[PDB]
């Protein structure tokens, strides 16, 4: 038994503005109002003009995947429009956009505890995904969305974010997602700096193989950096599982003096 995307009557949707474009099509912001329920803001993804039947199927499959998930740190699917043209995917609206862009616009504006809260949320969403045997493959701050309450949610259903065995052997697992998560931790604590800075992809691959790992971001707690290092263990089986990452973050949040050493 699988979940399926609810069909939304097109009359319940009001598109307000286009907010993003790409190869897939457009993303818009808008309102969803169904009879008897309060209006909410939504994101509306539309497939590019002139799409084929195959493109329509692949597009809606993203909705089918998303519809299997129900977790506060995974983007919520409101439904789809498939009875009318063009096809649309309707998801919860995330006021603050992508996490990488959000942090770069707010450099140094949050407390360590707020940043750790963001990471805990992402970790919780990834525990849920990995619990369901879903491997993301593209976990990065650009693929995390942020709401008005600073809640971070995994979306998007790249060499320097990728585990060395996934690059070298095409072995993608939740353990390679854990490597990526460590890079996301570094992005968060650095307010969206580019991992490995100006190093080229070839320089990154070689450095990682020789034992190089990213340093703590400026003023980053040593405990958080050690967790990054754990996520970047060379052997994938030595990395913490997402459940362990979340538990460690909960312990850091519960015992905030643990974050004092930098």
Ligand-binding annotation for 22, yes or no, is yes
| Preceding omega of 86 cis (within 30 degrees of 0) | yes
Distance, in Å, from the CA atom of 217 to the CA atom of 186, rounded to the nearest integer, reads 7
Name the CATH topology of 1-93. Answer: Phosphorylase Kinase; domain 1 (3.30.200)
Ligand-binding annotation for 20, yes or no, is yes
Neighbours of 105 (CB within 10 A): 12
Resolution of this deposited model, Å: 1.7
Residues 6 or more apart from 175 whose CB is under 8 A from it? Answer: 163, 236, 237, 239
Ligand-binding annotation for 24, yes or no, is yes
Name the CATH topology of 94-262. Answer: Transferase(Phosphotransferase); domain 1 (1.10.510)
Of 211, 180, 214, nearest to 197 by C-alpha is 214
Ligand-binding annotation for 19, yes or no, is yes
* Active-site position among 100, 138, 156, 177: 138
Please give the torsion angle defined by the CA atoms of residues 135, 141, 147 and 151, in that order, rounded to the nearest 10 degrees: 70
Neighbours of 244 (CB within 10 A): 15
Of 189, 161, 193, nearest to 177 by C-alpha is 161
Domain spans of the chain? Answer: 1-93, 94-262
138 belongs to the catalytic site: yes
- Calculate the alpha carbon distances from 138 to 16, 28, 110, 144, 155 in Å: 29, 23, 26, 10, 10
Ligand-binding annotation for 157, yes or no, is no
Of 112, 214, 217, 228, nearest to 180 by C-alpha is 228
3-class DSSP string for the chain = CCCCCCECCHHHEEEEEEEEECCCEEEEEEEECCCCCCCEEEEEEEECCCCCHHHHHHHHHHHHHHCCCCCCCECCEEEEECCCCCCEEEEECCCCCEHHHHHHCCCCCCCHHHHHHHHHHHHHHHHHHHHCCCCCCCCCHHHEEECCCCCEEECCCCHHHCCHHHHHHCCCCHHHHHHHHHHHHHHHHCCCCCCCCCCCHHHHHHHHHCCCCCCCCCCCCHHHHHHHHHHCCCCHHHCCCHHHHHHHHHHHHHCHHHHCCC
Distance, in Å, from the CA atom of 172 to the CA atom of 180, rounded to the nearest integer, reads 11
Q: Is there a shared CATH topology between the 1-93 domain and the 94-262 domain? A: no
Neighbours of 234 (CB within 10 A): 14
């Amino acid at each position: 038994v699988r979940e399926f995307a609810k069909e939304i009557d097109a009359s319940c949707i009001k598109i307000e503005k286009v907010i993003g474009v790409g190869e897939f099509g457009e993303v818009c912001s808008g309102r969803l109002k169904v009879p008897g329920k309060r209006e909410i803001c939504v994101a509306i993804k539309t497939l590019k003009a002139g799409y084929t039947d195959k493109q329509r199927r692949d597009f809606l499959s993203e909705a089918s995947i998303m519809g299997q998930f129900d977790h506060p740190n995974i983007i919520h699917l409101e439904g789809v429009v498939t009875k009318c043209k063009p096809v649309m995917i309707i998801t919860e609206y995330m006021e603050n956009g992508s996490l990488d862009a959000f942090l770069r616009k707010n450099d140094g504006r949050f407390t360590v505890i707020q940043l750790v809260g963001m990471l805990r949320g992402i970790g919780s969403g990834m525990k849920y995904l990995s619990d369901m045997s879903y491997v993301h493959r593209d976990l990065a701050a650009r693929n995390i969305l942020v709401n008005s309450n600073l809640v971070c949610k995994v979306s998007d259903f790249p060499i320097r974010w990728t585990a060395p065995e996934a690059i070298a052997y095409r072995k993608f697992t939740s353990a390679s997602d854990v490597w990526s998560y460590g890079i996301v931790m570094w992005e968060v604590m650095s307010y969206g700096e580019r991992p490995y800075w100006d190093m080229s992809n070839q320089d990154v691959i070689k450095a990682i193989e020789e034992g190089y790992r990213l340093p703590p971001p400026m003023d980053c707690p040593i405990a958080l950096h050690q967790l990054m290092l754990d996520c970047w263990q060379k052997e994938r089986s030595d990395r913490p599982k997402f459940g362990q990452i979340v538990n460690m973050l909960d312990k850091l949040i519960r015992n905030p003096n643990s974050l004092k050493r930098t």
